[PDB]
Amino acid sequence: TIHVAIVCAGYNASRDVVTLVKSVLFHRRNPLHFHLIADSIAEQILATLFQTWMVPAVRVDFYNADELKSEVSWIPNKHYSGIYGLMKLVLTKTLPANLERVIVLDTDITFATDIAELWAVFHKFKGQQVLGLVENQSDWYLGNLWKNHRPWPALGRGYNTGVILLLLDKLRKMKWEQMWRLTAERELMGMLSTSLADQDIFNAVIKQNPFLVYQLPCFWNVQLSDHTRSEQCYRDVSDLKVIHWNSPKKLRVKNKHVEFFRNLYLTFLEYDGNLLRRNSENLQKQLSELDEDDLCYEFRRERFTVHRTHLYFLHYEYEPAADSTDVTLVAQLSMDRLQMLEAICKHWEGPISLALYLSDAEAQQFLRYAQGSEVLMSRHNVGYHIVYKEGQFYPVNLLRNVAMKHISTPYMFLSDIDFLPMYGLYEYLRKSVIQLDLANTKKAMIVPAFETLRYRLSFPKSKAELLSMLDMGTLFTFRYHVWTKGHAPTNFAKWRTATTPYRVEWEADFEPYVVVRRDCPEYDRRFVGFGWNKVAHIMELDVQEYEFIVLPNAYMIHMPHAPSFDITKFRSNKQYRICLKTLKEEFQQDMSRRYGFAALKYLTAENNS
């Protein structure tokens, strides 16, 4: 068995840990056991990520850091990592005595070869040589990079904490705790604070006792920074196994042959991690009896699938409000449709949770785009949950549920990414929510839907101006030429004169856009793709005696968009339609079973139609 421990904190390092994990997994032979010293947010994200990865012969265990933040709090730090840099100092207190030797990797490492070869070095230590480390490739500790430099004392050039190799389960038998605490206290009275966090103190702990360390080969930790001489430490491609990026620039580091290093960085990150799979047994014995001859075999197989979800891709933050009535949009988006994102961002003020569906490479494409555009960065309160690509269908309900569950306000709005709201729709929905008093009853609010057929139009301001455009003829009701029954029962002719909200019942194929509490039912997953992805939720919410209210002054208007293959596959072959109807009626019978007489209504409708 190979064991390893990584400190994780912040969204950036959570991403670094995912890249490191795929790099390591590329060359595995043996079972692996990780230990992530993580805070609350990173733990929440990575638990789900690793629970959905389904990797065999891997066990991942997370150790809280908030409780153990105080252990090093007395040591001031200036490293960009923060207080979490010193967390590499108290692993013995966290990791139980059950283990004997364990790797320790910083989040930025990217393994180029098998980690078993590194694990091999745990039988090459002599006598009291317990700690494994590699010599720093810079001249930071030598005190000669620039005038008036006073680095912490160390032996020779100093050693870098990129890769730590522990062993003997001796650090407890030798009382490491007291000595390191005493060393740290002694090395803080003269100078101000640490410079490299753990790497700053460990070097001193090496100097005061030179014989614990085992001076590994330099070409083990090929540090990449502005003052590296690794060209002596590396000769060819095969002379390279593990690379570090010990600069805040990271991707913007400069070297003589940095091109090959950038290649070696994108060689693992680009890999589609869904091909690394060579809570489970349940999935196998449900997939086992899926009849291939069944007309819905592909759908049945797809429904049970689990896809790699990476919650909170970019930095997120939200200060809760006392009104406890805030709403948050939900949308499903793909890389064929991301251009109008900014349009939507400028038209929403409250928190919004999306759910992307990307393919690794494209995922990164989106990363570069978002890191370029200033509009997304100016806004800190937008989530990004990317459920990576897998299979051939479009599990839209999956992504909608993923955006549903992780939401920081009690209320939510269901819509599509192709639409667009007014200026201040957030505020009006807050007022309407606080007025209709949905805190107790199970009621829903509906925002009417329209569409337009001209790319470059101005954005209306008021209701009168809107109805002016409508009768001018540039706008119509949503789906007024393909699926008329979707919104026709709203009979906007009635709404035009409306001044207070009014309630409506359900009509055939009646698919509005709802604002609802966080307890609303999850979308039924058997249906994936395009078509009948919303109406099922509507009939679910209706059989549960949820009333509908249609807001008089709110509206939302569709922006033209090109078609995708989902609608084409919805119009291609009759088998897809037959399977769709099959699942429809299946849902009706089972829904009746769980509720009964109330469901007969819908059944009668199909008899009438």
CB-wise, 343 or 434, nearer to its own copies?
343
- # residues contacting Mn ion (CB under 5 A): 5
Report helix angle 535-543 to 597-608, nearest 10.
140
Give me the least distance between CB of 352 and its own copies, in Å please: 21
Q: Which two tokens stand for residue 593?
A: 């079973």
CB-wise, 179 or 264, nearer to its own copies?
264
- The DSSP secondary-structure symbol of 273 reads G
Binding flags for Mn ion, 432-471, as an x/- string (CB under 5 A): ----------------------------------------
Q: What contacts 38, CB < 8 A, 6 or more positions away?
A: 7, 8, 9, 46, 62, 63, 64, 65
Phi-psi region of 127 (alpha: psi -120 to 50; beta: other; left: phi over 0): left
Give me the least distance between CB of 563 and its own copies, in Å please: 6
Q: How far is CA 593 from CA 539, 581, 598, in A?
A: 15, 18, 10
Report strand pairing: 329-332 vs 411-414: parallel
Q: Which entry of its own copies, Mn ion, none binds 532, CB below 5 to 8 A by partner kind?
A: none
Q: Which two tokens stand for residue 57?
A: 């012969």
**Applying CB under 8 A, which residues contact its own copies?**
237, 254, 260, 263-264, 266-267, 270-272, 275, 278, 292, 335-337, 339, 359, 361, 365, 369, 372, 453-455, 560-565, 568, 572
Q: Which two tokens stand for residue 371?
A: 């890191």
CB-wise, 257 or 601, nearer to its own copies?
257
Q: Which two tokens stand for residue 465?
A: 């101006």
Q: Decide: 154 and 141 in contact? Cβ < 8 Å.
A: yes
106 is in an annotated binding site: yes
293 is in an annotated binding site: no
Among 246, 309, 334, 490, binds Mn ion (CB under 5 A): 246
d(CA 51, CA 604): 43
Only segment of 48-56, 84-92, 198-206, 240-248 that touches Mn ion (CB under 5 A): 240-248
Please, what's the largest Cα pairwise distance for the chain?
90
Does 511 bind Mn ion (CB under 5 A)? Our answer is no
Only segment of 38-46, 134-142, 208-216, 245-253 that touches Mn ion (CB under 5 A): 245-253
Picking from 322, 548, 320, 323, the residue whose alpha carbon sits closest to that of residue 431 is 323
CB-wise, 569 or 584, nearer to its own copies?
569
d(CA 455, CA 461): 18
Task: Give the count of beta carbons closer than 10 Å to the beta carbon of residue 380.
Answer: 12
Give me the least distance between CB of 369 and its own copies, in Å please: 6
Picking from 110, 103, 80, 108, the residue whose alpha carbon sits closest to that of residue 196 is 80
Q: Which entry of Mn ion, its own copies, none binds 117, CB below 5 to 8 A by partner kind?
A: none
Give me the least distance between CB of 264 and its own copies, in Å please: 8
418 is in an annotated binding site: yes
Give me the least distance between CB of 388 and its own copies, in Å please: 12
d(CA 131, CA 141): 19
Binding flags for Mn ion, 394-423, as an x/- string (CB under 5 A): ------------------------x-----
Q: Which two tokens stand for residue 608?
A: 């009438």
Q: Which entry of its own copies, Mn ion, none binds 473, CB below 5 to 8 A by partner kind?
A: none
- What beta strand segments (E) does 341-392 contain? 352-356, 382-387
Q: Decide: 360 and 270 in contact? Cβ < 8 Å.
A: yes
Give me the least distance between CB of 12 and Mn ion, in Å please: 12
Q: Which entry of its own copies, Mn ion, none binds 246, CB below 5 to 8 A by partner kind?
A: Mn ion
Does 247 bind Mn ion (CB under 5 A)? Our answer is no
Does 228 bind Mn ion (CB under 5 A)? Our answer is no
Q: First CA to last CA across the chain, in angstroms?
A: 63
Give me the least distance between CB of 478 and its own copies, in Å please: 15
Which chain residues interact with Mn ion by CB under 5 A? Answer: 106, 108, 246, 418, 561
* Binding site per annotation, positions for Mn(2+): 106, 108, 416, 418
